[PDB]
Every structure is written in C-alpha cells, then in structure tokens.
Amino acid sequence: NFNFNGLTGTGVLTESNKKFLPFQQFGRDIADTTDAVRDPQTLEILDIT
Amino acid sequence: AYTNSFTRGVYYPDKVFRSSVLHSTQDLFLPFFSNVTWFHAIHDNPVLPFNDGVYFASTEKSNIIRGWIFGTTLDSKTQSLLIVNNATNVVIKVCEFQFCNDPFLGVNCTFEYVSFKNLREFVFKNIDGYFKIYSKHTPINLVRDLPQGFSALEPLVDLPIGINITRFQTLLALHAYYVGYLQPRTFLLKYNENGTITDAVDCALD
Amino acid sequence: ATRFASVYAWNRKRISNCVADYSVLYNSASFSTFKCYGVSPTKLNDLCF
Amino acid sequence: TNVYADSFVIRGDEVRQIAPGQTGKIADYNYKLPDDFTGCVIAWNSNNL
Amino acid sequence: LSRLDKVEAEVQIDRLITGRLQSLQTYVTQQLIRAAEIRASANLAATKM
Amino acid sequence: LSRLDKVEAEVQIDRLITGRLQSLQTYVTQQLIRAAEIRASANLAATKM
Ligand SMILES: *[C@@H]1O[C@H](CO)[C@@H](O[C@@H]2O[C@H](CO)[C@@H](O)[C@H](O)[C@H]2NC(C)=O)[C@H](O)[C@H]1NC(C)=O
Ligand SMILES: *[C@@H]1O[C@H](CO)[C@@H](O)[C@H](O)[C@H]1NC(C)=O
Ligand SMILES: *[C@@H]1O[C@H](CO)[C@@H](O)[C@H](O)[C@H]1NC(C)=O
Ligand SMILES: *[C@@H]1O[C@H](CO)[C@@H](O)[C@H](O)[C@H]1NC(C)=O
Ligand SMILES: *[C@@H]1O[C@H](CO)[C@@H](O)[C@H](O)[C@H]1NC(C)=O
Numbered sequence: 001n002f003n004f005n006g007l008t009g010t011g012v013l014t015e016s017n018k019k020f021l022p023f024q025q026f027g028r029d030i031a032d033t034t035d036a037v038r039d040p041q042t043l044e045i046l047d048i049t
Numbered sequence: 050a051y052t053n054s055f056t057r058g059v060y061y062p063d064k065v066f067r068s069s070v071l072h073s074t075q076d077l078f079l080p081f082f083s084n085v086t087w088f089h090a091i092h093d094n095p096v097l098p099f100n101d102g103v104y105f106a107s108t109e110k111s112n113i114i115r116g117w118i119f120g121t122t123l124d125s126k127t128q129s130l131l132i133v134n135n136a137t138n139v140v141i142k143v144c145e146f147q148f149c150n151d152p153f154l155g156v157n158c159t160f161e162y163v164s165f166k167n168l169r170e171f172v173f174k175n176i177d178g179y180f181k182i183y184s185k186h187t188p189i190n191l192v193r194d195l196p197q198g199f200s201a202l203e204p205l206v207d208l209p210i211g212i213n214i215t216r217f218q219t220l221l222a223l224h225a226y227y228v229g230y231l232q233p234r235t236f237l238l239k240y241n242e243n244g245t246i247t248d249a250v251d252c253a254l255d
Numbered sequence: 256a257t258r259f260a261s262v263y264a265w266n267r268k269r270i271s272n273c274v275a276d277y278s279v280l281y282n283s284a285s286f287s288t289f290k291c292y293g294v295s296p297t298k299l300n301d302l303c304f
Numbered sequence: 305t306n307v308y309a310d311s312f313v314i315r316g317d318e319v320r321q322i323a324p325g326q327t328g329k330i331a332d333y334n335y336k337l338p339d340d341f342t343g344c345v346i347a348w349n350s351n352n353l
Numbered sequence: 354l355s356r357l358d359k360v361e362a363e364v365q366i367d368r369l370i371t372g373r374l375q376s377l378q379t380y381v382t383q384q385l386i387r388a389a390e391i392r393a394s395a396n397l398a399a400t401k402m
Numbered sequence: 403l404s405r406l407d408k409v410e411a412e413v414q415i416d417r418l419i420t421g422r423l424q425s426l427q428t429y430v431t432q433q434l435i436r437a438a439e440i441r442a443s444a445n446l447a448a449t450k451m
C-alpha cells in the first residue's frame with residue numbers, strides 16, 4: 001500500500017524499463033490511474049502494476 | 050517582416066509521463082503554419098507586448114543576446130522580472146530595475162535564483178502566478194528562417210513568481226531573432242515509445 | 256421609515272409601475288446580511304418583474 | 305507544490321461574506337476566492353491585538 | 354443563466370443535465386432496438402426479392 | 403479518499419458512482435443489442451451451412 005507525495009494506492013512496484021524525463025513524476029494510463037512514478041527522494045523510476 | 054511558424058511551437062504541456070499514445074490536450078500553443086514576426090539584431094530594442102505567452106527564438110551560436118527583460122512599465126516603479134546570462138548561470142531576479150531606451154550588457158528585491166548552426170528556441174508563459182520557462186538547443190545548417198522540420202521544446206524551469214507581465218524587451222550586445230504569440234488551441238500529442246513527442250496536430254487549423 | 260411594523264402586524268407594501276434601482280441599495284453598506292433565494296443578489300438589476 | 309498564506313484583518317459580520325463564491329462587498333471589491341477554491345480559512349477574534 | 358451566479362447556477366443546470374441526457378440516451382436505445390427490428394424486416398424483404 | 407473525512411467524501415464518491423455505473427450500463431446495453439445482431443448473423447450462417 002504505497003503513498004507517493006500523498007497519492008496512496010495499492011499494487012506491486014518494480015524497476016522501470018522505461019526512460020523517464022527529468023521534470024516529470026507520474027506516468028498515467030488510459031484508465032487515468034498511475035502506472036509509473038519516480039521516487040520522491042530517489043532518482044530511480046518504478047513501474048506500478 | 051514575417052516567416053512561417055512551421056511546427057516547432059510545441060512543448061510538453063504538463064509533467065505527466067506517457068508513452069506510445071495519442072493524447073488530446075488543450076493548452077496554449079503557437080498555431081501551425083501561421084505567421085511569426087521576424088526581427089533583426091542591428092548594431093535597437095523594439096517594443097513587443099506579452100500576449101498570453103510568447104514564443105521566442107534566435108539563430109545564434111555566439112551569444113549576442115545576454116538575457117531577457119520582462120515587466121509592465123519598466124521604470125524601477127514596478128516589480129519587473131529580469132533574466133541575464135552570465136556565461137556561468139542563467140540568473141533570474143525579480144526586483145525594481147532602472148531601464149533606458151538601449152539597456153544592455155555589451156562591449157525592493159523579492160526573488161533571487163542562480164541556474165548560425167543552432168536554434169536556441171525558448172518559450173515563456175505566465176499563468177496562475179507561475180512563470181514557466183521552456184527551451185531547446187537544436188542543430189541546424191540554415192539561418193534566414195526557421196526550417197521545415199520538427200522540434201519539441203522541453204521545460205527547464207518552473208518559477209512560480211506572481212507578477213503581471215504584459216510587455217517585454219530583450220537584450221542585445223555590442224561586439225536575427227524571431228517572436229510569436231501562443232493562443233488557446235486544442236492539440237493532439239503523439240508520445241512515442243521513448244515518451245517524447247514526435248508529431249502533433251493543431252485541431253482547429255483546417 | 257421612522258416607525259416600523261411589529262411582526263404580529265407586519266406591513267406589506269406593494270411596488271409596481273416604477274424603474275427599480277437595487278444597485279445603489281446593494282452597493283451601499285448598511286446591512287448586516289443580504290441573502291437571496293432562488294436568485295443571486297447581484298443579478299436582480301438584470302431581470303424584470 | 306506551493307502554499308500561499310493570505311494575511312489580513314476584517315470585521316466580524318463580514319466573515320459571513322469571506323466564503324468562496326459568496327458575494328458581498330468585501331468579497332467582490334477587496335479580496336476574492338474562486339468558486340473552485342481549495343484551501344483553509346482561519347479566523348480568530350482580536351480584542352487585545 | 355440570467356438570474357444566478359456561478360456556484361448555484363451550476364447546480365441547477367446540473368440537475369437539468371442529468372435528465373436531458375437521460376432522455377437522449379433513452380431515445381438512442383429505443384431507436385437502436387427499433388432499427389434492429391427494421392433490419393430483420395429488411396433482410397426478410399431482400400430474401401423475398 | 404486521501405483528502406476528506408466521511409460525510410463529504412461520501413458525497414463526492416456518490417457523484418462518481420452515478421455516472422461510472424451509468425457508463426457501465428450503457429456498455430451493457432450496447433453489447434446486448436450488438437449480440438442480438440450477431441445472433442441473427444449466426445443463425446443465418448448456420449442456415450447456410
Ligand atoms: C497588468 O499590469 C497592467 C499594466 O500594464 C495593468 O493594466 C492596467 O489596468 C488598468 C485597469 O484598472 C487600466 O486602466 C490600465 O490602462 C491598464 N494599463 C495598460 C497599460 O493597459 C493590469 O491591471 C495588470 N493585470 C491585472 C489583471 O490587473
Ligand atoms: C531526505 O533524505 C534524502 C535521501 O534520499 C535526502 O536527499 C535529503 O537531503 C534528506 N533530507 C533531510 C536529511 O532532511
Ligand atoms: C501574414 O499572413 C497574414 C495573413 O495570411 C498577412 O497579414 C501578413 O501580411 C503575412 N505575411 C506577410 C509577409 O505579408
Ligand atoms: C558570474 O557571477 C557573478 C555575477 O556577475 C560574477 O561574480 C562572476 O564573475 C560571473 N562570472 C563570469 C563573469 O564568468
Ligand atoms: C522601493 O524602494 C523605493 C526607494 O525609492 C521606495 O520609495 C518604495 O516604497 C519601495 N517599494 C516599492 C514597491 O516601490
């Protein structure tokens with residue numbers, strides 16, 4: 001049960017195969033729910049399933 | 050003077066990642082295949098208004114331009130925002146400043162911040178007390194006009210500031226920039242596999 | 256009016272055949288509260304009754 | 305991402321009027337809160353301040 | 354629209370929306386079923402022809 | 403859920419419910435009619451076979 005910058009939620013986190021842009025935080029779906037985040041205090045990028 | 054604003058008036062509208070999807074959005078944009086007013090660096094500093102954001106660019110590689118001037122009267126009696134290039138740090142300051150009819154570097158503060166074969170394409174926009182600065186440094190080989198081709202400005206800086214801006218100037222130096230205006234448009238954005246914009250469509254063009 | 260109606264015997268005065276000017280009655284400040292129901296107090300100058 | 309503290313003082317019968325989207329003299333001429341406002345309003349009585 | 358400000362006009366309008374939209378969706382559903390019936394009749398008529 | 407207590411979160415959620423549910427029911431109705439069309443096609447195909 002994660003909480004990233006106040007956005008709670010549930011899922012399994014894993015390392016990203018994606019290439020992330022250095023101003024963004026959140027990758028968002030057609031379903032309009034978070035799919036990919038960046039750590040609020042680390043530079044690693046995590047895919048949310 | 051006028052040239053054709055081909056397609057390089059486009060940027061990422063938000064800080065939200067997407068990949069391999071065509072996402073409609075609406076934001077301020079420079080409309081495709083409209084005019085963009087052109088000017089020349091001589092030795093002047095012509096008077097330009099700030100209208101719901103501004104597109105700016107300069108074909109240069111030698112930094113004749115030293116920075117930018119933003120304000121609303123420019124007489125040390127308003128809170129005018131200034132950008133200056135030190136050649137070490139793009140510095141932004143928000144203080145009342147004394148200006149003339151040829152103010153530049155050549156041969157009550159409330160903010161401090163320390164940061165031709167190339168187009169140094171920049172976009173500035175002021176909304177809800179946010180002053181957002183975008184950029185791109187791209188290679189070319191032509192010089193008279195911006196070429197046919199695609200480019201995607203990325204954000205560099207989000208300064209929240211909160212002063213009114215409705216006019217601007219720009220710095221020259223003693224030792225051929227462009228300008229256009231953004232307006233409300235619905236746009237379609239094609240994020241690719243990498244998550245970078247590659248092409249877009251101005252929904253109300255034709 | 257210098258003398259008012261009691262709530263037991265409350266006064267109903269009627270208004271017609273005139274041009275209203277509520278804006279000067281609004282825009283002046285002498286009133287603890289100014290509430291309107293089904294209608295917004297700024298908008299009365301637009302309608303016509 | 306940001307927080308703005310909007311500081312001032314006001315009379316008591318006029319904090320009936322400070323609410324967002326609520327009309328009135330102070331709300332429309334002096335200081336306005338949008339109808340889509342999000343945030344907190346604090347008020348405390350001042351009798352020795 | 355001619356008698357209210359934003360925060361309450363939006364409410365009354367929204368009441369109208371949920372229900373005009375409902376009427377439209379009812380009409381669509383009826384027409385769809387009626388069209389399917391008409392299709393069956395048309396295929397029969399083509400068969401007869 | 404991450405920004406409100408019960409009595410108002412329930413309201414905002416309820417706004418979402420009446421409308422997500424409506425979307426689902428629309429989808430169901432469309433699929434049902436489409437299925438009936440497909441049935442007609444299938445009976446025709448069985449007849450041809
Ligand atoms: C933006 O700053 C400008 C000044 O450039 C303000 O514009 C003035 O507004 C008043 C309205 O009371 C007019 O009488 C002036 O003529 C305007 N000046 C000019 C030069 O057009 C403006 O108030 C500021 N922005 C906002 C939203 O208030
Ligand atoms: C918070 O922890 C992170 C570690 O990733 C660090 O970047 C930051 O400076 C720390 N802040 C402190 C110690 O307050
Ligand atoms: C810009 O296009 C508009 C209308 O198409 C026109 O006003 C303007 O003069 C054009 N550019 C030039 C060089 O004339
Ligand atoms: C950059 O920063 C300050 C601002 O004027 C100055 O001390 C320094 O010399 C500048 N750098 C140069 C001229 O390279
Ligand atoms: C700015 O400094 C000047 C000094 O001339 C002073 O008169 C003025 O009150 C100060 N504040 C502003 C916002 O101008």
Ligand SMILES: *[C@@H]1O[C@H](CO)[C@@H](O)[C@H](O)[C@H]1NC(C)=O
Nearest residue numbers: 019241242243244245246247
């Ligand atoms: C996007 O990713 C692919 C990996 O298959 C890579 O070949 C391509 O160069 C990347 N695009 C950019 C603009 O780097």
